[PDB]
């Protein structure tokens, strides 16, 4: 019972994703497709990339990732469809639901979308899309997402052999974006966790840890060079006491970030992604 | 075949609800998972409280509702997970589809969230959710809207006997919130219903017909001590006459609700809940 | 394994889609239902049409197409029920995916809805919704989209006879609707493309062609009669050259459209809809 | 002790209006340029109207009133000079100033902007502005509103004579707009919304009212764009709705039937906004 | 060389403020009008208490302020005309212009608009404004700002006597309102932003400062609305923040601690307004 | 006689800038006080030399300019006091007034506020404002549009000595800043948007025009921010355009190529503001 998980910078006010979706149900029938995100801001690999990164662990093993924003749709450029290794605490009841490695495709553009994907997972072999077995002859030119991630998605989804749908990538032909580096700590917000208003950071649980931070450690997170809050570390948002009070956490992602229990923090002071950060103790 | 109706607060903008998904066909391989909503207001049980309570009668007998604000996630708080007993006109084709009693659960944080639920529904026993065999035996603190509700209602809907997911509580243990009473009717305003701009109020069928109100009357609807419309009450908005005409109304809910043919009465007028209400004929 | 896509005004900040869809189990188990869009504007028939219009030949053979705005919902109106002929380039990998002709059935308002799906597809019988095995026999007057759209197309998905719903329809009790037509070409902007800010025009391929307008042919498109865009004609948007430049192309529709690369158009400008278009060359 | 009173659409955001108020200085030292109004909505004459039809008794007599709204700037359009007759009860302490006929120029472009005016007051002789003594010889393009309206407006102030300004007018040759009607019940629309309070004018006077057998203290009941109503008595002033929020009709200081909150607003809670069908049911 | 100072809340779009200009050259020939604001909060009596209570230093002795927000307009409330006592370090050159007690007039609604004023500069005869000499025998419901404040403002500003108003007040039939108060770490809230530049006023006096053992070049922590914290040194102007944009706590130019950013706002990218609680820790 | 024409950045929102004025007529009775205006953008010292540039040919000789935006106020930055040469065809009625050379002083911070007003002008003396005889012993830090410059236009006004003021300066001493470039096909940049109209001003100038060979009733493409098109015949007034929302493009008042709709707004509805490229093309 095939499963692709689908993301996109399609939107969800036309029929575009319905379109998609049509055509994987045709080729991989009794596929269920799992709807990821489909708002994210368009051309914004970096975003993306962000939404598709901690997947593989929640969904079950053979689940095909499609994951799309195609700025460079109608062009020489093809997608690249990549068979991970590791998975990555495991989620879900008891101790949680392990995951063979080699057990999980994405298929995307190749510019720099899997960045992160690649990097905190690794991945076995790589392969550019051009058969016309898994894409279209005569590609809509504007249409790259259905066309070159979309279609070919659900002929993996149906066990089409990834070896088979282009020639062999090497590293150095897999684009890559790169992130902003964590140097007391400096940082910067990534983003905005909506509806909550909740701020995160690129801050991880490893680089705390690494200054001698845990629970309970009394913190300064300054936002911009002008917002100097102070909390202590803590599991979650209503050990900050009473509602609206700062909280202090690590995130589902393991990142340091802050919010407001039971209110939000950024919408309306309009903080938002790109602000930088210190940490002190 | 198995169906998870899902209503959270986790929005439509990340990865957050596809990781409670992926996790729901790990469990229960064949689920389908029915989005009720995710756009909620944060944190607002009597907003989602609304949208769940009527939704028994639609789906399947055997549907687990998993159902899920969470602003206490990380505390000793736990979710309940409760079989109601009426379903409760009929829908469907025909005169309709009877729904046997004890046929649907609710699991949701022990916050108020079903207070409507078990009253107009009622229910047979209700449970702590803390079995590590629905839930993990190390929650995210930070995400028990995945961790003790979307995980163990896939368990559920996979035949786990609800009496074993944990403790049975007393009724006295089970959270509750209190809506205003309805005392010529004073009521409020509950929802704006978008995007028609369609105005509801807390004033039940049952209230008009307790008053001598029927279909017909003509009735004053008044908003905020100074909006005073007038009206026959009509079965729906295009007995109104022309377009734009304001019409009265009981919605599909069975309550009193305003509206203009074809045209949004809310939205142009910035009129939105908790305005007060005041009816007369 | 039915499917049944589903497009209406509905919305989705309420539990009101879910209703339908969990009809839609309970009447045809098994059945998948593909979300088109919710979010259109209400009542705009003419803008409904264009989700819905060009989505055949993406679908398995027997998708049933549930689509509808019902302001005239709780009236003497029923809903219309058709099987068109041609599905119509081939949607898919290869050469695409040759669909049999009487292989889709529209179900939805009679309200001009599926004006241009008769049209662009043509139609072997269309018959009024009637019966009380397709509907109910005491529909809630506010909730047509449910009614009489929903919960017949989830009986026609499971394999009810089409000539069944009741009575059958001349040509002329089809409502429908007129669109602008084109006349050196002048048009009209249809659609802004979210989220990425795109203009979209009622000049189709074939207007071009016929005014000997063929790939990379230099034209001014002209908005309000105050914008002279100038462009060649191209298949796509990096084809433009660098970011932000102005591209004229044929969108995935088939038709005139102009944007950016890898740059908004629309939004920063607030050029909408309606906006009256020439285009020279 | 000579007195322009000014008024235009050029706005409180760069020097235009210390333009024209240096040269009427220039032209005519010792006067005092008392500031009406500089914020109108442009081009809009027929706001510009209400903003000076009221104005002479509040003044006194030999006040010039330059009043100019030009999108036609830089045409043949010429401006107009015009003494009034009636400057209407008195304003002031006690019984009032009482103004004698004749007292008041208005100067403005011939585009309708004073329909008002002369309809309410009157006129005696009206000019048309074409002398190279009270205007430039050659006038930049873009401000007529300086070159045709302060600059001649100045001079008069000065003493300069009105027949003087070029050739007499006949009422023909005085563009004029069409107020918005009154039907009747009565039917009407919303002139102006009164900031920064929020208080919601509409065309519909005093006259009006007393012709459909309307009084103070009686019940109104008021819709507005054919769907929002509004129910009250018709009352003197806002505090005699009673709570503060409370709904009031009344006449404004210019005779027209006026909506409100008292000591709150009603117009920016419900986006309410000029152009609005007004109907009054008694 | 008369001189009347106006504040009121009539606005800057429409002839409101005009006509009361008007009468008052009508009244008082060769007065001249100083704006001071009319652009205030519709209504809000504390704050235009602050427009007005540092004015008679700035201003020549005999000078008549005009000040009123009439939200009871048309009612039984009636104005008050008060000769103040103490001017109150002298403002403009050298050392300062030396302002003799008593040498000027304030007349206001008596809703509490001078609460301030009073209290400040302290007064010595304060009457109720009844005279039909100086204001209008029918008064326009509507219009007080105009019939009891700006009308008698002018016959004071012509030498007309303050004690023939009308009758004398005692201090118990002057209204007053209680400011907000400051809670002692001080507690406090804001009382104004700073149009345009976005500054944020508290109610936080020097003399709370002092008395909490804080001076000039001390560190602080602020917080506003209890979640949003800033800290830096008390300074005594915005460039003592160092860089363009960087925050700064002085004291304004009336006595208050005050936050913002340096040739940067500080309001509007957090959409800070008047009202948000204010606590200040050292 | 004596003139003060006020500019700044004080705003339209308190008692600001009625404390100057206040001052003004306390120093020079019998003054008056002419707003140019008060709303600039704050801190923005190109957008408020627009302000100020065009004014001496329409002000009567031996006018006061005082033009002020502070954001160094507290500082030891000063105020210069400046006798400009040229008042540049001339305005007001006929052929106009002939406006004598040195007739004009403009005193402003010297933090570049005067760059234009000085190269169109040229100017003769300038001198650094430091005498206690003009400002004050003790300036309040925040006040120094007060202070430095309110404050000694008046006496300045009033007849004190220029040279009085303080020490004479040298071309080096005086700050300026650089205009925005204009690049030769023509690219410039908008340089304000004029309200309430929501007319373009850009950079570039007729002289450069005219020295691309781009003349009256020709057609232009004008692109702004590298996407925006608009083409017209280059006319001098807004009706040249046609039907009302029709496109033009003309030179503005002060010589500077413009785009506008007729009798409509241009900028609001595609949100355009200053800053934005222009590139213009034959
Ligand atoms: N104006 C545009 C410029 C560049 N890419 C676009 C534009 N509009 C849509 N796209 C891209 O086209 C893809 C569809 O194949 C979308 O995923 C999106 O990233
Ligand atoms: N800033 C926050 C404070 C309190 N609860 C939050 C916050 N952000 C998210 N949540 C809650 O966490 C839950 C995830 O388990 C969400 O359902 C939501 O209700
Ligand atoms: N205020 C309204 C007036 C007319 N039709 C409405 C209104 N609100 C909802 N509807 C219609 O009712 C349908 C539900 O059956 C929706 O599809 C919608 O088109
Ligand atoms: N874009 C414009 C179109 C038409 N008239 C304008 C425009 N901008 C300013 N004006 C007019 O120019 C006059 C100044 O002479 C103003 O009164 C105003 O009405
Ligand atoms: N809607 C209103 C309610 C109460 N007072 C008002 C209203 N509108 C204007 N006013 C008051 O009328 C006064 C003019 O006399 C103004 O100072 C103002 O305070
Ligand atoms: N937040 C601020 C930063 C820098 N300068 C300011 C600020 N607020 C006001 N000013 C300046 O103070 C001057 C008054 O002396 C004004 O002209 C203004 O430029
Ligand atoms: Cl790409
Ligand atoms: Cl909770
Ligand atoms: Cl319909
Ligand atoms: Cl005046
Ligand atoms: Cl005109
Ligand atoms: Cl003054
Ligand atoms: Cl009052
Ligand atoms: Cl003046
Ligand atoms: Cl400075």
Same mark, same amino acid.
């Given at each position: 019972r095939p499963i692709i998980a689908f993301m996109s910078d399609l939107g969800t006010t036309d029929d575009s994703v319905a379109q998609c979706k049509g055509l994987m149900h045709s080729i991989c029938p009794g596929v269920t497709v799992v709807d990821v995100c489909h708002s994210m801001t368009p051309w914004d690999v970096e975003e993306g990339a962000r939404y598709i990164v901690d997947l593989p662990r929640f969904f079950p093993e053979g689940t095909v990732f499609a994951t799309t924003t195609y700025? &460079?749709?109608?062009?020489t450029t093809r997608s690249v469809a990549v068979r991970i290794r590791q998975a990555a605490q495991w989620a879900g009841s008891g101790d949680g639901f392990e995951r063979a490695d080699g057990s999980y495709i994405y298929i995307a553009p190749?510019?720099?979308?899997?960045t992160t994907v690649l990097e905190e997972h690794g991945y076995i072999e790589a392969y550019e899309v051009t058969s016309t077995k898994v894409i279209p002859a005569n590609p809509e030119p504007t249409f790259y997402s259905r066309e070159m991630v979309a279609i070919p998605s659900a002929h993996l989804a149906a066990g089409?052999?990834? &070896?088979?749908?282009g020639r062999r990538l090497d590293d150095s032909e897999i684009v890559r974006f790169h992130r902003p580096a964590v140097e007391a700590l400096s940082g910067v917000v990534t983003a905005i966790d909506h509806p909550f208003g909740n701020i995160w950071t690129n801050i991880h649980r490893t680089d705390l840890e690494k200054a001698g931070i845990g629970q309970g450690k009394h913190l300064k997170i300054i936002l911009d060079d002008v917002l100097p809050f102070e909390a202590p570390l803590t599991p979650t948002f209503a050990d900050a006491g009473a509602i609206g009070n700062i909280a202090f956490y690590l995130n589902s992602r393991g990142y340091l970030s802050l919010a407001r229990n039971a209110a939000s923090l950024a919408y309306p002071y309009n903080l938002k992604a790109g602000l930088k950060v210190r940490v002190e103790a």
């Amino acid at each position: 019972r095939p499963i692709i998980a689908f993301m996109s910078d399609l939107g969800t006010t036309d029929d575009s994703v319905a379109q998609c979706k049509g055509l994987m149900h045709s080729i991989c029938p009794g596929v269920t497709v799992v709807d990821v995100c489909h708002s994210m801001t368009p051309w914004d690999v970096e975003e993306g990339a962000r939404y598709i990164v901690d997947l593989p662990r929640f969904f079950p093993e053979g689940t095909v990732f499609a994951t799309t924003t195609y700025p &460079a749709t109608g062009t020489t450029t093809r997608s690249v469809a990549v068979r991970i290794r590791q998975a990555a605490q495991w989620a879900g009841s008891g101790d949680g639901f392990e995951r063979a490695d080699g057990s999980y495709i994405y298929i995307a553009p190749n510019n720099g979308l899997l960045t992160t994907v690649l990097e905190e997972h690794g991945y076995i072999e790589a392969y550019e899309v051009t058969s016309t077995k898994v894409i279209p002859a005569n590609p809509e030119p504007t249409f790259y997402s259905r066309e070159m991630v979309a279609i070919p998605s659900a002929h993996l989804a149906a066990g089409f052999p990834l &070896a088979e749908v282009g020639r062999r990538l090497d590293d150095s032909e897999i684009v890559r974006f790169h992130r902003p580096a964590v140097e007391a700590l400096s940082g910067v917000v990534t983003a905005i966790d909506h509806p909550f208003g909740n701020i995160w950071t690129n801050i991880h649980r490893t680089d705390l840890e690494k200054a001698g931070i845990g629970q309970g450690k009394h913190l300064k997170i300054i936002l911009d060079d002008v917002l100097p809050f102070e909390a202590p570390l803590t599991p979650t948002f209503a050990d900050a006491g009473a509602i609206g009070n700062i909280a202090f956490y690590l995130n589902s992602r393991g990142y340091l970030s802050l919010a407001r229990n039971a209110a939000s923090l950024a919408y309306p002071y309009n903080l938002k992604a790109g602000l930088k950060v210190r940490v002190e103790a």
